[PDB]
Design an enzyme around this catalytic site. Structure first.
Site, short mmCIF file in Angstrom:
data_model
loop_
_atom_site.label_atom_id
_atom_site.label_comp_id
_atom_site.label_asym_id
_atom_site.label_seq_id
_atom_site.Cartn_x
_atom_site.Cartn_y
_atom_site.Cartn_z
N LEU F 41 10.33 3.92 1.10
CA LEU F 41 10.96 4.31 2.35
C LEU F 41 11.31 3.07 3.16
O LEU F 41 10.53 2.11 3.25
CB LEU F 41 10.03 5.22 3.15
N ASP F 42 12.50 3.08 3.76
CA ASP F 42 13.03 1.95 4.52
C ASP F 42 12.20 1.67 5.77
O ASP F 42 11.24 2.40 6.06
CB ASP F 42 14.48 2.21 4.91
N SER F 43 12.55 0.62 6.51
CA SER F 43 11.87 0.35 7.77
C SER F 43 12.10 1.48 8.76
O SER F 43 11.16 1.98 9.39
CB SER F 43 12.36 -0.98 8.36
N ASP F 45 13.21 4.50 8.02
CA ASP F 45 12.88 5.79 7.43
C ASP F 45 11.44 6.19 7.72
O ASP F 45 11.16 7.36 8.02
CB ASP F 45 13.15 5.75 5.93
N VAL F 46 10.50 5.25 7.63
CA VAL F 46 9.12 5.55 7.97
C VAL F 46 9.00 5.91 9.44
O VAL F 46 8.14 6.72 9.82
CB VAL F 46 8.19 4.38 7.57
#
Ligand SMILES: CCCCCCCCCCCCCCCCCC(=O)OC[C@H](COP(=O)(O)OCCN)OC(=O)CCCCCCCCCCCCCCCCC
Ligand SMILES: CCCCCCCCCCCCCCCCCC(=O)OC[C@H](COP(=O)(O)OCCN)OC(=O)CCCCCCCCCCCCCCCCC
Ligand SMILES: CCCCCCCCCCCCCCCCCC(=O)OC[C@H](COP(=O)(O)OCCN)OC(=O)CCCCCCCCCCCCCCCCC
Ligand SMILES: CCCCCCCCCCCCCCCCCC(=O)OC[C@H](COP(=O)(O)OCCN)OC(=O)CCCCCCCCCCCCCCCCC
Ligand SMILES: CCCCCCCCCCCCCCCCCC(=O)OC[C@H](COP(=O)(O)OCCN)OC(=O)CCCCCCCCCCCCCCCCC
Ligand SMILES: CCCCCCCCCCCC(=O)OC[C@H](COP(=O)(O)OCC[N+](C)(C)C)OC(=O)CCCCCCCCCCC
Lengths: 654, 124, 89, 83, 182, 85, 481
Positions: F41-43, F45-46
């Site tokens: 998960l991206d920065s 996205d989390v």
């Protein structure tokens, strides 16, 4: 069996017995006992009202003396007449319903004995307020309902925000009470008495400047009590207290006392046409501001409270038209459906696990709570003055009176009132849609656990739903009847215009508020369900004006920064710069410093010298020579020596 | 330090800490404090005017500046009252005469006297 | 029921303290009788209003006017004004 | 739901969820005292009750107004607005 | 009432002498010493002398009994304050419910409070002889003395007639007393 | 009333992550899985996921405590640490 | 009797060692004796009744049966009986409020407290300017010693304030009394309204009397000693100073000033109204920024005294009755509030700073209920004697000057503000972290508070119950032609 004595004494028992015996009885018994006492009071009141419509001969109850000093004779006197019985209908009905509702709503709360004692306390003191036969008994009730409001709004004592809300309410209503005391002093001086009988006997002969002074003070008091736009701020803060408290305070008793104080004073107010004017335009402002704030609010209880503010403004407009019967009828009708709205909101709130009050956090609940939906719907349609409902017979005729009023300029009020009316629909639909129609906005577990409430909640809502459908129609003849003599207030014949407002009204004006209400309600619902963009834009300017309305027309900031905070700064200036500044300088600190320097100088008059003999001899020579020269000066002119003596004292001590 | 009234006290301290004051209401309420309700930690210095900045002080509103809020409040009152006053001019005239009453306006029924009929007495 | 004899400041010598005390008490008691008369008028007025209703303006005009007339003059006024001042001079 | 609370804290209102074990007997006492008090008050205040209208006769009212007119004629009393 | 005993007292002193000072006499919190503390402290509420001996006897006995009572009171109250137990029943029982009279109660409840009740009663009945009632009666009597025929009228008419006469005529004497004002 | 259990919290979070479309795989979601590493998960996205968690259990995560949770077990122990949720 | 009673005192002291039970008994007997006097007091008479003379040349140690009066005169009328009843109600409570918290040198402490009470009681019996002045000053050294030895940390400065300020005002009163003495060669209160001084000399004598009144009441701007003295005093000192000693000034206005200097008083009344309005407004606002509980309570008394002054100088019967009723009600309620802040909280925590106190309702619900009741009594909630006094005082003030009394009506709000601001923080919120839980109010503390609340409620419901002692008084001092 004496109705008046029981009506007074039974709520007193329901108040005091829990405080005496709560630890010994427990909240189970206390809740049931207080509710039963209030029910019996309500029944006795309904019977008295029935007989009074039979025969308008009020009962008086005349008790011991309060004051019998020089010409001022004040007695604990009570009477129940038409005005009082209308008030008592509202008070006792809503109080019994709120007592029953609280058994369910507060079932979990640890402190139920205190809560029910306080609800009964409020009922007792409000009964005292309306049944008194002179302004002193009225004031006794006036101050005690303020005390009780303080104890109720701060019921959840550990909550900081609740304590501050209570402080707000008690202080703003003490501002009102200060002007009340001013008015009582003027009344006692001018009339020699506080009794209603004497004041209404002789008020038509009184000088008009004095009557304006008295009525202005009384109106500032009522303004604070009924939350007109001068002193409204505490009304929305009062939603910190438990919901049944809000149901009792905003429908039946507290915010109605102001209206009552104007209704009881109508005989004086006929002869003060200036303050009637101020009352009228204050009410127009109040209803407009309340509706505008309501359209932009997100808290359910806050929207209902602002609706109360708008309705009180509407009653105040009615007062300003001298259609006192109209304002009285709207008070009585508004109490029932306002109580129903608040109780239904309490049900909605308890139906959420979070117990959130944000209308933005509900959203699909029609399927889940059909009965709370129907109750809240009935109350809203009563408020919107939909045809054939109790609110119709009060709101619409008050709106039309402004057009029918003899005063030409009053036409403007029509439009103001009309705008308020349509504005009302807009917020009602907004809470109706956002709670029941919209699309779910809460998480999934809340909808799983969303259920209806117990019987203790449901039964009062059913009873008040019946009231909010039927009472207005069954009572329209008593208060708005072509020559009804039930409320016997002496309206100056030149002023009375209730016939003109019925015969002179056209189809356009008689029909336009109704059609506008219907059309706006449908409009709001359909725009929410189909064009959400128009409501949910992102314009910077519109967001600004919305922010203005959402923060109570920044009134609460204006009060808190420019009056209250400035006042605390000024108090700091007085306490530090004056009390502990200048006043200590002309006091212990300044005198201490002065005496220190003076004493030091005089003792050091001979400090550095080594030979005491030489110095003391020089002193005796200097003394002799100086006394000779001083006396020579005095022989010349005594005024010239005063500066020399001042200089010598300066040399010695400074 | 920030406000005029805290500045005015600057000559009045000698050897008391000159604290820059911050309203306790505006401290973030997710930090942890020894007194959570007051948002204060033990031994934290107090400003000389601390009573005007603690939690029990009057509430402060952040969304607008005080000056702009004053503008908006005055402006709302101005536009409402001015609009109402102006509207008073463009008003239709009524269609029926104000009503009247027998006995020269029932001046006797409203008290009144032969010698004083203008004080008490209706439109007749 | 006591009826002490009335004494006037104008007759007595201010050095008999018994006479001066009696004159002061006489003055105060007469003022209280006047207050009783005003209260009688006001009570009659209240009764008239409560039995007349809408026609009180007619049926109680005399009582209303007389109450308003006696209000400024039938209150307590003390005795010090009259004992320390001689109206003749 | 519920939570612990200090048992030594004695309040006239009962404190926390006050539900004494003998509450039904105590309620019987309390209701008896309530009924006694209400009935005593209702009966004792009965002599001080009266109706508002038809308690004085037209004779008294008319003659009192006549006497006040007599009083106002002995003094020189014009009416309000009479000038 | 006479209750003194010098024989008991001179031995009570030594029975105190074995014990630690009442400040340190319970700071352990064995039970035998605590039991003796219980008994000797229980002596504080067993009143040891009445009036006939304080009035009659001499100051050496008085000084000794005073000292004894000082240490007894210290022991009793310190045990009560630390242990939470009353020093009766005789080993330090817990039974605090009742049987606890303070030294001010009798005075404040049987002298001060009845005095206040008597004052309230006296004020209530003194208010009956207030000038307002006297002047009501005096106005009535003046009217009745000037117009005695309203005596002949029946009771219920009488009061209305006195009211009528009061309304019509200025029955006060204030202006009469104002002789020099012509 | 209503009371949640540790397993109820876990089941809700697992269904929540299963609903997310940016995830690598659904079968690979463990209690001790790392969103940054395992789920990739991206920065931001989390952040979206923490926001979903707070919108689901009705609580309010501060900035400092939001960025601290890196694993699913961390999320679960945080959500069970909070009394009203 | 005196010999026998002295023997009784001596033996009690020998055996018990603590004098306090004897003092409580003596004061309770004094209260009963005053009630017996009230029973035998004739109310249908404006003459002084239980008269006696001390230190006459024919009988210096006895009562005077001589045809020449050169001693000190004593006697009572209804006005003085009212304040005497208040005094004898209060004295035993001031003994009982320090029953357990005085431990070192307690016999001297109780002796000082009882002596101060007895001096005030005798002061209300004084029938001439010199006897009044003597008993007026005699409290100052006793208060100095009591505050210096048994006061809190700042009690040296406080003892010096309570001596020096009161001496300062009293010496100008002494100038006035000397002038009256040499100009009239008489000093008694029985016939002093029979002497009519020239208006100029009246105007001069008034100034000295009023300077003393200004310091003793106190009034703005010479009030700043009272908060310090109240804050540092032990509890009995505060109770006597707020409940009794401040009432001596109101009594002095009625007894020493109005009957003698009537015309000058008429001339000076607007200046009095300026001073009283300043007192009310400015001290009420200054209370808002105080951080000491006892200081806040002390500041409250000054504003109520301003209202009483406005009533007593109104030249109306209602105003004078309201001033007296307000004095009595304040004498009930203010000692109760001082009991709460300096007797209950201070004996548990030994600190008076407002920041330390919060949310006392949790562990001490009874004390919180007392606080709420006494607060709403202090701000003049109706059915309390405080409301009757304030309402009648404001009526009289408004009649005397409509603008000034009308503005004075803001005191309702201002008092509500400072008092409810204190009680809101004291009762609400979460229990404070800085203090540990203590006992709720004790039986003795509740007894004292109950006495005071019942008294204020009884005169609040039926204020007319004082009229049988005061109906002559409400006419004795007004000056109307
Ligand atoms: C037209 C002008 C209308 C004026 C109305 C009268 C103003 C007095 C009302 C004072 C008041 O209500 O302040 C209460 C304040 C609570 O306000 P807040 O903290 O915002 O409540 C939070 C709850 N949601 O809590 C407080 O701040 C109490 C602290 C003292 C408040 C008053 C300080 C004196 C300032 C002068 C007040 C008015 C002076 C006379 C007018
Ligand atoms: C016409 C003939 C009749 C007689 C009338 C004659 C009138 C004039 C007489 C003049 C004679 C000279 C008197 C000499 C004494 C002055 C001594 C002196 O200089 O002390 C001044 C003192 C300065 O003290 P300091 O500590 O430096 O300043 C801080 C003050 N907060 O400053 C102070 O502290 C004074 C502050 C106190 C303010 C007054 C206090 C009450 C009045 C005493
Ligand atoms: C007319 C005179 C009427 C006098 C009424 C007599 C009252 C006697 C009984 C009062 C008992 C009230 C009480 O004790 O409330 C205490 C309350 C905490 O009680 P609780 O709810 O049980 O527990 C919460 C945490 N333990 O703590 C509180 O929250 C304080 C609230 C006290 C409520 C007092 C009610 C009277 C208010 C009117 C005062 C008017 C003053 C004049
Ligand atoms: C150091 C300060 C300055 C000191 C200067 C003054 C010192 C005075 C010393 C206190 C003594 C005064 C009290 C005792 C005098 C009263 C004795 C008495 O008998 O009063 C006479 C009065 C009339 O009595 P008679 O004419 O004989 O007829 C009786 C018919 N059965 O009978 C009555 O009417 C009863 C009168 C009751 C008076 C109440 C007195 C209350 C206070 C008594 C003790 C006060 C002690 C104060 C101690 C501190 C010092 C001030
Ligand atoms: C600074 C502190 C200053 C302290 C000031 C206190 C001064 C106190 C002076 C005492 C004199 C006042 C006494 C009040 C008189 C009360 C009384 O009458 O006592 C009885 C007796 C005289 O009584 P008699 O004259 O017969 O009148 C009563 C007739 N029914 O009286 C007597 O027989 C005399 C007994 C009193 C002896 C006093 C001795 C001085 C104190 C040692
Ligand atoms: C508690 C809720 C209210 C309960 C009311 C029940 C009333 C039943 C009987 C009433 C009789 C009555 O009041 O009479 C009052 C009697 C005589 O008055 P009257 O002039 O003869 O008639 C009155 C009616 N008039 C005038 C119209 C004809 O004087 C008194 O007693 C007053 C004594 C005051 C005592 C001190 C006050 C104590 C207050 C205690 C506060 C806790």
């Amino acid at each position: 069996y004496n109705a008046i004595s029981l009506i007074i004494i039974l709520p007193c028992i329901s108040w005091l017995f829990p405080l005496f015996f709560g630890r010994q009885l427990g909240y189970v018994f206390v809740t049931r006992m207080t509710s039963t006492l209030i029910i019996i009071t309500t029944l006795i009141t309904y019977y008295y009202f029935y007989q009074l419509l039979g025969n308008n001969n009020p009962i008086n109850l005349e008790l011991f003396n309060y004051l019998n000093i020089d010409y001022l004779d004040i007695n604990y006197n009570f009477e129940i007449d038409a005005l009082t019985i209308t008030m008592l209908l509202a008070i006792t009905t809503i109080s019994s319903m709120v007592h029953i509702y609280s058994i369910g709503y507060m079932e979990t709360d640890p402190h139920q004995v205190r809560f029910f004692s306080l609800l009964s306390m409020f009922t007792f003191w409000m009964i005292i307020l309306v049944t008194g036969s002179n302004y002193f008994v009225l004031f006794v009730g006036w101050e005690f309902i303020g005390v009780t409001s303080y104890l109720l709004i701060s019921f959840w004592v550990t909550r900081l925000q609740a304590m501050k809300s209570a402080l707000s309410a008690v202080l703003m209503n003490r501002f009102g009470d200060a002007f009340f005391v001013l008015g009582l002093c003027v009344i006692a001086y001018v009339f020699g008495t506080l009794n209603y009988s004497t004041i209404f006997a002789t008020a038509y002969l009184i000088n008009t400047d004095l009557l304006v002074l008295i009525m202005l003070a009384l109106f500032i008091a009522a303004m604070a009590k009924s939350a007109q736009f001068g002193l409204h701020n505490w009304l929305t803060l009062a939603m910190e207290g438990p919901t049944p408290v809000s149901s009792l305070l905003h429908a039946a008793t507290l915010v109605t006392a102001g209206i009552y104080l104007l209704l009881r004073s109508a005989n004086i107010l006929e002869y003060t046409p200036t303050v009637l004017f101020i009352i009228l335009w204050i009410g127009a402002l109040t209803t407009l501001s309340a509706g505008l704030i309501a359209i932009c609010s997100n808290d359910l209880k806050r929207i209902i409270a602002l609706s109360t503010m708008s309705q009180l403004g509407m009653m105040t407009i009615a007062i300003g038209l001298s259609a006192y019967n109209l304002a009285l009828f709207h008070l009585l009708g508004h109490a029932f459906f306002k109580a129903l709205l608040f109780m239904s909101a309490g049900s909605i709130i308890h139906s959420i696990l979070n117990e959130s009050q944000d209308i933005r956090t509900y959203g699909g609940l029609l399927s889940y709570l059909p009965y709370t939906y129907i109750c809240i719907t009935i109350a809203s349609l009563s408020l919107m003055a939909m045809p054939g409902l109790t609110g119709y017979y009060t709101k619409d005729i008050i709106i039309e009176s402004t057009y029918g009023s003899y005063s030409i300029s009053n036409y403007v009020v029509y439009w103001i009132a009309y705008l308020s009316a349509v504005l009302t629909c807009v917020y009602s639909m907004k809470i109706l849609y956002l709670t029941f129609y919209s699309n779910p906005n809460n998480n999934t577990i809340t909808y799983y656990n969303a259920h209806e409430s117990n019987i203790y909640i449901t039964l009062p809502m059913f009873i008040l739903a019946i009231f909010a459908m039927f009472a207005g129609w069954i009572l329209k003849d008593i208060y708005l009847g072509v020559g009804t003599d039930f409320v016997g207030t002496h309206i100056l014949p030149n002023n009375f215009s209730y016939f003109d407002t019925e015969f002179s009204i056209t189809q356009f004006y008689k029909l336009l508020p109704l059609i506008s209400a219907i059309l706006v309600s449908i409009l709001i619902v359909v725009l929410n369900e189909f064009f959400a963009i128009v409501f949910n834009l992102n314009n910077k300017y519109i967001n600004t004006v919305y922010s203005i309305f959402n923060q109570k027309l920044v009134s609460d900031q204006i009060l808190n920064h420019f009056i209250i905070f400035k006042g605390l700064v000024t108090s700091g200036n007085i306490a530090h710069h004056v009390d502990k500044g200048s006043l200590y300088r002309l006091g212990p600190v300044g005198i201490n410093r002065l005496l220190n320097k003076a004493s030091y100088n005089v003792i050091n008059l001979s400090s550095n010298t080594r030979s005491s003999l030489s110095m003391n001899s020089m002193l005796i020579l200097i003394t002799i020579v100086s006394l000779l020269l001083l006396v020579l000066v005095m022989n010349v002119n005594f005024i010239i020596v005063i500066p020399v003596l001042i200089s010598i004292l300066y040399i010695l001590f400074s | 330090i920030r406000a005029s009234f805290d500045k005015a006290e600057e000559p009045m301290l000698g050897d008391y800490p000159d604290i820059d004051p911050f309203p306790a209401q505006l401290k973030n309420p997710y930090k942890k404090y020894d007194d959570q309700q007051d948002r204060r930690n033990l031994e934290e210095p107090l400003s000389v005017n601390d009573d005007l900045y603690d939690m029990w002080s009057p509430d402060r509103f952040t969304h607008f500046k005080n000056q702009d809020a004053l503008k908006y409040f005055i402006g709302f009152l101005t536009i409402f009252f001015g609009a109402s006053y102006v509207a008073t001019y463009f008003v239709p005239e009524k269609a029926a005469i104000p009503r009247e009453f027998p006995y020269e306006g029932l001046w006797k029924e409203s008290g009144g006297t032969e010698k004083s009929k203008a004080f008490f007495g209706q439109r007749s | 029921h006591q009826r002490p004899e009335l004494v006037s400041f104008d007759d007595i010598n201010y050095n008999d303290h018994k006479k001066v005390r009696e004159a002061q008490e006489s003055y105060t008691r007469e003022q209280f009788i006047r207050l009783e008369a005003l209260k009688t008028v006001r009570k009659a007025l209240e009764k008239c209003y409560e039995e007349s209703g809408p026609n009180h303006f007619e049926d109680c005009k005399n009582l209303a006017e007389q109450y308003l007339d006696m209000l400024p003059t039938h209150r307590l006024q003390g005795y010090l004004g009259y004992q320390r001042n001689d109206p003749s001079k | 739901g519920r939570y612990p609370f200090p048992k030594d804290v004695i309040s006239m209102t009962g404190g926390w969820w006050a539900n004494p074990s003998n509450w039904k007997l105590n309620g019987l006492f309390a209701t008896g005292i309530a009924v006694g008090l209400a009935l005593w008050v209702s009966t004792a205040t009965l002599p001080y009750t009266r109706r508002r209208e038809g308690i004085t006769s037209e004779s008294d009212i008319s003659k009192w107004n006549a006497a006040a007119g007599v009083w106002r004629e002995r003094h020189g009393k014009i009416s309000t607005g009479e000038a | 009432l006479r209750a003194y005993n010098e024989e008991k007292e001179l031995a009570l002193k030594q029975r105190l002498s074995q014990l630690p000072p009442p400040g340190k006499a319970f700071v352990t919190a064995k039970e035998a010493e605590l039991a003796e503390l219980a008994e000797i402290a229980a002596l504080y509420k067993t009143d040891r002398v009445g009036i006939l001996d304080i009035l009659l006897l001499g100051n050496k006995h008085a000084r000794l009994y005073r000292d004894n009572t000082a240490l007894l009171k210290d022991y009793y109250y310190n045990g009560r304050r630390i242990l939470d137990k009353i020093p009766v029943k005789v080993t330090w029982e817990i039974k605090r419910e009742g049987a606890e009279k303070e030294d001010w109660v009798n005075q404040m409840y049987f002298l001060y409070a009845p005095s206040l009740i008597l004052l309230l009663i006296v004020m209530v009945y003194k208010s009956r002889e207030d000038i307002t009632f006297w002047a009501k009666k005096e106005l009535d009597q003046r009217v009745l003395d000037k117009h005695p025929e309203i005596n002949d009228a029946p009771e219920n008419e009488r009061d209305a007639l006195i009211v009528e006469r009061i309304i019509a005529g200025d029955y006060d004497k204030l202006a009469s007393l104002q002789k020099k004002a012509t | 009333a209503h009371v949640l259990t540790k397993d109820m919290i876990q089941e809700r979070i697992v269904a929540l992550l299963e609903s997310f479309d940016k995830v690598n795989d659904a079968k690979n979601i463990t209690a001790t899985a790392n969103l940054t590493s395992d789920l990739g998960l991206d920065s931001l996205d989390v952040v979206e996921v923490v926001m979903a968690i707070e919108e689901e259990f009705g609580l309010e995560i501060p900035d400092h405590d939001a960025d601290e949770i890196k694993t699913v077990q961390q999320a679960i122990d945080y959500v069970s640490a909070q009394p009203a949720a | 009797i005196l010999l026998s009673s002295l023997y009784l005192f001596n033996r009690i002291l020998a055996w018990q060692g603590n004098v306090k039970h004897f003092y409580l008994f003596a004061s309770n007997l004094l209260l009963l004796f005053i009630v017996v006097l009230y029973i035998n007091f004739n109310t249908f008479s404006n003459s002084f009744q239980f008269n006696f003379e001390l230190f006459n040349s024919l009988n210096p140690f006895g009562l005077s049966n001589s045809d020449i009066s050169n001693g000190l005169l004593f006697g009572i009328d209804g006005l003085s009986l009212t304040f005497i009843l208040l005094t004898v109600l209060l004295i035993p409570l001031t003994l009982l409020g320090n029953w357990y918290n005085i431990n070192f040198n307690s016999n001297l402490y109780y002796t000082l407290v009882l002596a101060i009470g007895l001096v005030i009681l005798l002061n209300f019996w004084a029938l001439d300017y010199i006897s009044f002045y003597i008993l007026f000053e005699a409290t100052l050294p006793l208060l100095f010693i009591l505050i210096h030895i048994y006061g809190s940390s700042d009690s040296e400065r406080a003892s010096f304030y309570v001596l020096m300020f009161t001496l300062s005002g009293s010496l100008f009163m002494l100038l006035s009394i000397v002038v009256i003495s040499i100009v009239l060669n008489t000093t008694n209160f029985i016939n002093h309204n029979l002497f009519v001084l020239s208006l100029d000399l009246q105007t001069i004598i008034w100034l000295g009397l009023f300077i003393a009144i200004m310091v003793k009441t106190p009034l703005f701007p010479i009030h700043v000693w009272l908060p310090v003295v109240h804050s540092e005093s032990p509890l009995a000192g505060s109770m006597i100073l707020a409940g009794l000693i401040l009432k001596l000034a109101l009594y002095a206005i009625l007894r020493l000033l109005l009957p003698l200097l009537c015309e000058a008083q008429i001339l000076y009344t607007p200046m009095i109204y300026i001073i009283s309005l300043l007192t009310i407004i400015l001290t009420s606002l200054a209370t808002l920024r105080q951080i000491d509980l006892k200081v806040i309570i002390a500041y409250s008394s000054i504003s109520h005294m301003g209202i009483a002054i406005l009533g007593v100088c109104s030249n109306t019967s209602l105003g004078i009755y309201g001033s007296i009723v307000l004095g009595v009600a304040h004498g009930f309620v203010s000692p109760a509030l001082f009991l709460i802040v300096g007797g209950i909280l201070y004996d548990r925590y030994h600190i008076r700073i407002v920041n330390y106190y919060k949310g006392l309702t949790t562990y001490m619900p009874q004390l919180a209920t007392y606080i709420i009741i006494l607060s709403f009594a202090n701000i003049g909630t109706p059915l309390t004697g405080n409301f009757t006094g304030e309402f009648l005082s404001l009526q009289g003030g408004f009649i005397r000057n409509p603008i000034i009394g009308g503005i004075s009506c803001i005191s309702v709000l201002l008092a509500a503000i400072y008092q409810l601001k204190l009680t809101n923080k004291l009762t609400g919120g979460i229990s404070s972290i800085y203090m540990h839980r203590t006992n709720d109010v004790t039986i003795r503390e509740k007894f004292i508070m109950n006495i005071l609340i019942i008294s204020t409620l009884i005169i609040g419901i039926c204020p007319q119950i004082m009229y049988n002692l005061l109906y002559w008084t409400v006419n004795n001092y007004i000056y109307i032609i």
